[PDB]
Amino acid sequence: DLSEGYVFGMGNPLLDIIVDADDFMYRKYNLKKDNIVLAEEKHMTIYDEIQKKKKLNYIAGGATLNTVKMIQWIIQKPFVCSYVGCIGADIQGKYIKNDCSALDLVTEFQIAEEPLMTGKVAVLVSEKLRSMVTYLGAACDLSLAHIEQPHVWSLVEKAQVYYIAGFVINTCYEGMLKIAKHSLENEKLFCFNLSAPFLSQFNTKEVDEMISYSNIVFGNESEAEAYGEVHGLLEDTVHATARYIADLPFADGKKRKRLVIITRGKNPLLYTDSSDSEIHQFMVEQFKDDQIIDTNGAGDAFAAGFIADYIRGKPMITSLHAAVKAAAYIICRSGFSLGSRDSYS
Ligand SMILES: Nc1ncnc2c1ccn2[C@@H]1O[C@H](CO)[C@@H](O)[C@H]1O
Ligand SMILES: Nc1ncnc2c1ccn2[C@@H]1O[C@H](CO)[C@@H](O)[C@H]1O
Ligand SMILES: [Cl-]
Structure with missing residues (x-):
């Protein structure tokens, strides 16, 4: 609990x-x-x-938001998850804010100055x-100041697990960096997502810096390839990238285990960690063409599924199955739609 x-x-x-x-x-x-x-x-x-x-x-929507609120949805215990983002003072922002409250997700939204819209x-x-x-609109205005407020920063301090998508590099890198440093300093669990190929190509420094604070890194095949090319991993790029990212030193230079998971669509996902010399394949759920409704957000769900189980002490394989289930649930649905928790099976 x-x-x-x-x-x-x-x-x-x-x-x-x-x-x-x-x-x-x-x-x-x-x-x-x-x-x-x-x-x-x-x-x-x-x-x-x-x-x-x-x-x-x-x-x-919003990658980080999708993941964290699905973690909340999975765990079912009210207020276990907390989220911080910047919306606008418009109906779209309020809709999103009400979407979160309905899920028992504790939020502290920063509100952007009008007329910057959500x-x-x-x-x-x-x-x-x-x-x-x-x-991105209002999302860009998320500031270190908002985060450093006592009533906001207290959410970070009581947190034992963090999830921040690479996407936040474009909006508030200083905030995510500060939280990452806090996490590694207090030996907490910091989870990071590669999010998109362009981030590894155009924000390589920020990606690699975040990795140095990350205990768990999530990626997909496309991101792994973009990352690998940028780092001169020309042969066996995806596998090479998993190994490289896993083996990257932590910011304090201390010996620690970093888990890396690279999803590959319908094909087996790859995983490894710093202490593991090998890269493992894990088979995922098979879908007929007509079963696939909308795969958008599958990655966000995958991460939520893995984390929600992993942080409750479930073993690696068990957690990977929970991740696939979370992803498959979203795949059979339009948009990042979370229905009634009872019908999750
Ligand atoms: N076309 C497919 N068939 C079956 N699963 C799919 C897809 C596409 C995505 N996924 C699932 O989503 C996870 C993260 O992308 C992947 O780990 C995976 O479980
Ligand atoms: N630059 C960004 N920052 C944060 N989230 C982002 C983007 C771009 C797209 N998305 C969100 O990704 C979800 C699909 O995984 C979609 O739900 C979509 O909202
Ligand atoms: Cl995000």
Whole structure:
């Protein structure tokens, strides 16, 4: 039985806008398969353009938020998880804030100065391509000051486990760095997600620095390849990356075990740790084509599933199965939708 605020996350609270996109959209905005981009000016028309389309699905998002609130949902004990993010003073931000309260997730949202609106993600869904365009908006205003407030920082201090996605590097690196240093200093469990290929390519220093404070690092095949190329791991890139990341020294240079898990879609995931000379394969659930509804957020769920079991003392393999279950649950659902806890099986 975990104490209240045992798990802490900070991240980008965003609204997912899920649309059945036409094929021209992907060529028009130069969007790649399963890719994530931070919007530039050339992307900005996308948001008004998709508003013209029917059947829009508006649902709470944000990688870190998805994970931490599903941990909360899994554990069922009220207020075990706490989350910090920056939203805007708009209806979207309030919707997200109410979504959290409904899940018994303790939050301390920073509110961005008007008229900076809550961030949003355009999720373009089609048969051939899945792609995301991110407008961070209010999420960028998350500040070290907000975090260092006594009523906020106290959430961090009582936390024994942290989850922060790589995505937070673009919004509040100073905050996530401070918390990571606190975690390693008090021998707590800091969990980190590689989140997206562009982070390893363009924010390599921040990624590697975070890794040096991370006890558990989550990644997928795509991120592992981008990471590996950047570090000159030309042969056996994915395996080489798992080994490299696992073996990277901790910030204080102390000998410690860092667990690394690299998911590979429908194919077996890889895992290893610093003390393990080998990399293991773990088979995952098989899906027929018609069973796959929407894989978006599967990675977020995977992490939540693993952590929720691992921090309660379940062994590695047991925790990996719980991670796949969490991921499979999201896969059979549209958006990061958490239904009634009873029907989780
Ligand atoms: N097409 C598929 N078939 C079965 N599982 C899938 C997919 C795609 C993703 N996943 C599950 O999500 C986890 C993290 O991506 C992966 O670990 C994995 O469990
Ligand atoms: N730059 C970012 N920072 C934080 N979260 C992000 C992004 C971009 C996309 N997402 C979130 O990722 C979820 C899918 O795993 C989607 O639910 C989507 O909201
Ligand atoms: Cl995030």
